[PDB]
Design a protein around this ligand. Structure first.
Ligand SMILES: C[C@H]1O[C@H](O[C@H]2[C@H](O)[C@@H](O)[C@@H](O[C@@H]3C(CO)=C[C@H](N[C@H]4[C@H](O)[C@@H](O)[C@@H](O[C@H]5[C@H](O)[C@@H](O)[C@@H](O)O[C@@H]5CO)O[C@@H]4C)[C@H](O)[C@H]3O)O[C@@H]2CO)[C@H](O)[C@@H](O)[C@@H]1N
Ligand code: CA
Ligand code: CL
Length: 496
């Protein structure tokens, strides 16, 4: 469950948050494959509650009504077509699996769901599964409200209702079997693994019992005996009884300390600075590298949900965000996930965004297609971070340096730092208020290299900055603090 199952030499996944299946399939073919992306995390593919107040929020997708593959992203046929077309070009698909709970206990009964299935939360009736009152934890929870009241009590965190969401009885074999049926349907289609949503709210032993029922990956694309890649969402920032390490038996775990601390460093908040990143990783108290799923922001914390945190960097602070993402992709710690977002009407009212619920770009609830502008950016209000040159070219940097040791570290005692990955790549950052200009040891063979942050290599020339590495591996770097991108990266495949 720890191996990504990506094609050899592809090292990252991109979260195409709320994108339609037909758009993802085209994106695999035209962009992700030739650019070396390993895989795509998709939003929940299972039928959910259509919530009309507020209007079609992104979060309605975390309120399941059935395991039918019918959502605003498209139907079962479109889902199958996407997975096929992606695997056929060597790009994997990872599913966001919502298995802790069904919908909110106070949603009205009826057929207001993305596939028209009837459901009755009040009587616990979900006949398209089917589930009944017998399949929920109402009798097991011991709080007055039936909802989670206290994160200091590990038992109620697992047995009671997260924010009123109907809590599935994952202790019983019937429920475990219905969930396993859904996941096996996905695996046979050609899915390479799963983000397990709300993992903190399930017993690690109940997750195990469901994963024991899973098939091996589809033998047309994957070697015999391949297991789905599993990464679990657990928010463990310290100081509560549940620990991310309680989940290592099942797969990888999301390391939320990563993006909170890196955002603080890059913003230079709290007395922190880039020279302290010399021991980034386990030195900062993070979980082991071989268990971590890392990221700068995710779909929750980029809009103040989940753990939130003011330090989080997102597309909305583009200049610092590209640097943070650039550091993450150059550094060997963890398995990396890049976010891909949409814009929404951000409106603050006593220091909270009251529009944090807004769903993807839409026409009366119908998801807008991803259009591609002539300069290769996206229209219709999709951000497409994954197509920003500085991010895409760092996704390739990580592939080119895969397996190479962290070496040749330099720092000025403040916010000018540089490091190498073996003899395959070198990266230089200026986050200080003055120019960085210095001759440094790169570890690279002699030659002319294109800086892949400012430009691209094409036809034996560069479109941006060029760096000249001499016979002893040294090169001069000059980065103004006023630079729009104040970092430089070169690697073995950017050499002329
Ligand atoms: C009925 C309910 O509907 C709406 O709730 C929505 C939320 O606002 C959305 O954020 C979204 O939640 C998703 C989800 C549930 O499917 C789980 C994910 N993330 C969770 C995390 O798993 C939880 O543990 C919890 O995090 C807490 C930490 O564990 C604590 O340590 C501490 O830091 O507090 C945090 C915050 O409580 O909540 C996280 C968000 C998943 O990725 C989420 O996207 O969807 C739900 C369901 O629609 C309404 O917003 C709400 O008011 C209604 N009561
Ligand atoms: Ca639970
Ligand atoms: Cl996540």
């Amino acid at each position: 469950q720890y191996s990504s199952n990506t094609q050899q030499g592809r090292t990252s996944i991109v979260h195409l948050f709320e994108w339609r299946w037909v758009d993802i399939a085209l994106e695999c073919e035209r962009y992700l494959a030739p650019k070396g992306f390993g895989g795509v995390q998709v939003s929940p593919p299972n039928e959910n509650v259509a919530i009309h107040n507020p209007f079609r929020p992104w979060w309605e997708r975390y309120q399941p009504v059935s395991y039918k593959l019918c959502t605003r992203s498209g139907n079962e046929d479109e889902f199958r077509n996407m997975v096929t077309r992606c695997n056929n070009v060597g790009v994997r698909i990872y599913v966001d699996a919502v298995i802790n709970h069904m919908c909110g206990n106070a949603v009205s009964a009826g057929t207001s769901s993305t596939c028209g299935s009837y459901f009755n939360p009040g009587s616990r009736d979900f006949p398209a599964v089917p589930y009944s009152g017998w399949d929920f934890n109402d009798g097991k929870c011991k709080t007055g409200s039936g909802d989670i009241e206290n994160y200091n009590d590990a038992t109620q965190v697992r047995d009671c209702r997260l924010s009123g969401l109907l809590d599935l009885a994952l202790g019983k074999d019937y429920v475990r079997s219905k969930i396993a049926e859904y996941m096996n349907h996905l695996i046979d289609i050609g899915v390479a693994g799963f983000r397990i949503d709300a993992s903190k709210h399930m017993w690690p032993g109940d997750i195990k019992a469901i994963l024991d029922k899973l098939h091996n990956l589809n033998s047309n694309w994957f070697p015999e005996g391949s297991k789905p890649f599993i990464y679990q969402e657990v928010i463990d920032l310290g100081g509560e009884p549940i620990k991310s390490s309680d989940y290592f038996g099942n797969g990888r775990v999301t390391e939320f300390k990563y993006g909170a601390k890196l955002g603080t460093v890059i913003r230079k908040w709290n007395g922190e600075k880039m020279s302290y990143l010399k021991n980034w990783g386990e030195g900062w108290g993070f979980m082991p590298s071989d268990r971590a799923l890392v990221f700068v922001d995710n779909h929750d914390n980029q809009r103040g949900h989940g753990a939130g945190g003011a330090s989080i960097l997102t597309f909305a602070d583009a200049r610092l965000y590209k640097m943070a993402v650039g550091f993450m992709l150059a550094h060997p710690y963890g398995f990396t996930r890049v976010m891909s977002s949409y814009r929404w009407p951000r409106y603050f009212e006593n220091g909270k965004d009251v529009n944090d619920w807004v769903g993807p770009p839409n026409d009366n609830g119908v998801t807008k297609e991803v259009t591609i502008n002539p300069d290769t950016t996206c229209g219709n209000d999709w951000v497409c971070e994954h197509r920003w040159r500085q991010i895409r070219n760092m996704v390739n940097f990580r592939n080119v340096v895969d397996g190479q040791p962290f070496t040749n570290w330099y720092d000025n005692g403040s916010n000018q730092v540089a490091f190498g990955r073996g003899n395959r790549g070198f990266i230089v950052f200026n986050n200080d208020d003055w120019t960085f200009s210095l001759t440094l040891q790169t570890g690279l063979p002699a030659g002319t290299y294109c800086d892949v942050i400012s430009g691209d290599k094409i036809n034996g020339n560069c479109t941006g900055i060029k760096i000249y590495v001499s016979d002893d591996g040294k090169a001069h770097f000059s980065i103004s603090n006023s630079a729009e991108d104040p970092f430089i990266a070169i690697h073995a495949e950017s050499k002329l």
